[PDB]
Amino acid sequence: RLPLIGVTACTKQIGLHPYHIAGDKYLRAVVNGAGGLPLIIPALGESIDQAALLDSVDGLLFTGSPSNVEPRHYSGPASEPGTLHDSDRDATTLPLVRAAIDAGIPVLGICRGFQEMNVAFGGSLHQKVHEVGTFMDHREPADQPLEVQYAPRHAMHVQPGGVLAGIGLPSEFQVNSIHGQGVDRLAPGLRVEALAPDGLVEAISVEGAKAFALGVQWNPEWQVLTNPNYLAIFQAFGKACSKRAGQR
Amino acid sequence: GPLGSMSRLPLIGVTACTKQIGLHPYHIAGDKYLRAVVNGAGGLPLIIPALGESIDQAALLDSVDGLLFTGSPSNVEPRHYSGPASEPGTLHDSDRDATTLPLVRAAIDAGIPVLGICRGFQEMNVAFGGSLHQKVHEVGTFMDHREPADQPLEVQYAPRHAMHVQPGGVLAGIGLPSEFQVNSIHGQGVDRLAPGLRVEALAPDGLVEAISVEGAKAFALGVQWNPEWQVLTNPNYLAIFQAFGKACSKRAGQR
Ligand SMILES: [Mg+2]
Ligand SMILES: [Mg+2]
DSSP: OOOEEEEEOEEEEETTEEEEEEEHHHHHHHHHTTOOEEEEEOOOGGGSOHHHHHHHOSEEEEOOOSSBOOGGGGTOOOOOTTOOBOHHHHHHHHHHHHHHHHHTOOEEEETHHHHHHHHHTTOOEESOGGGSSSSOOOSOOSSSOHHHHTSOOEEEEEOTTSHHHHHTOOSEEEEOOOOSOEESSOOTTEEEEEEOTTSOEEEEEETTOSSOEEEESSOTTTTGGGOHHHHHHHHHHHHHHHHHHHTO | OOTTOOOOOOEEEEEOEEEEETTEEEEEEEHHHHHHIIIIIOOEEEEEOOOGGGSOHHHHHHTOSEEEEOOOSSBOOGGGGTOOOOOTTOOBOHHHHHHHHHHHHHHHHTTOOEEEETHHHHHHHHHTTOOEESOGGGSTTOOOOOOOTTSOHHHHTSOOEEEEEOTTSHHHHTTOOSEEEEOOOOSOEESSOOTTEEEEEEOTTSOEEEEEETTOSSOEEEESSOTTTTGGGOHHHHHHHHHHHHHHHHHHTTO
């Protein structure tokens, strides 16, 4: 049976109405890269039974987003006014990350979802990576089209002995970079999977997780079938989801 | 849920629309539909992306206990019922059509409870061989069912015309009164009623505004109005969502 893979929604006001939204490129990556059947998880927080939710899925994709985790979740400084937040999503995903990993449900986090994984286990974020002084500007260039904004823009150094090494990624490869926030303090119990050239942690796995649990700061859903390094990540996630699906 | 109940919670799929937002294509669903599934039907909503038959709809349906076909500002493309070309500027969502029209039929053949609202009611009619009027207000004896777009949501989604229940069907069976007022946020409507569909209710101008699928093995109801709007405060809207939820719970009990 094909794995049912949950995909986290964002919230968005569209005209007069509130919506729950999920990007097509994530959904198509789940179908084409992971071999799964995607269903979108609305950002309803613990308004609903997350244990019943987890029972019905074979894996979870925590997507990227223009929005940012609220800093209160890591006791960080208040955000600059106008920073984009999605408290409904935060209320959904931070407990969901912890619960899924405890249940042995495969997890892949992309960009915001990677940041969610670090915060959910007690880590913190830099809200303006480009201003810390130690890091490059990891944001996508404004005033450029999508194909430029999502193209590879910096190197990625795989740390040996973990998930990315096990999947067979090269020791250094290029990744896109569409993020203003990033890991500050690494949560306890997380393994560093990869570093950008300025030392920014851009991939993590969860030590002692019973099942696949990987987050990456870049956006590997982008034209996934045509980037072998991105496709390998989705294929590895899909195989984990299929293993869970096959134990039903 | 009810005090002391241990019944399995139904997983209810909710249809997405497609929309470009900022630089990217998205699949979207209105919060009011999702909250009505939780509060009115007692289910756990998951959104079904508008991926058409690029995925295995039968395998998707195996994992859900019910389906809500939502309303939308967009309109079914008229090719699906051999209709006249739409006026230029008409909003369509062809990726949604490619998902929902086959999904309606597959769901009913699999015994998955179906509730269609507004566009979803129209989809039910088209999927079984009926047709639509693209501008109801220009046709026959029909009146203007469209919402006043210069007004706040509270006015737009308040009850604006009567609804006359036709005896002997689902709506009478769940105990709705013979006449009640409904909201009206639609410019299209039923023209040819699909074969095998029961007329459940009529607007005062004769427009068919509710149908049920005769011979369906499970709950299969569509309504042209928008009962998800403040569903708990309107007893007629709530009765519809409760009946849907009970059917979804019956299927969940079979897992
Ligand atoms: Mg980067
Ligand atoms: Mg009407």
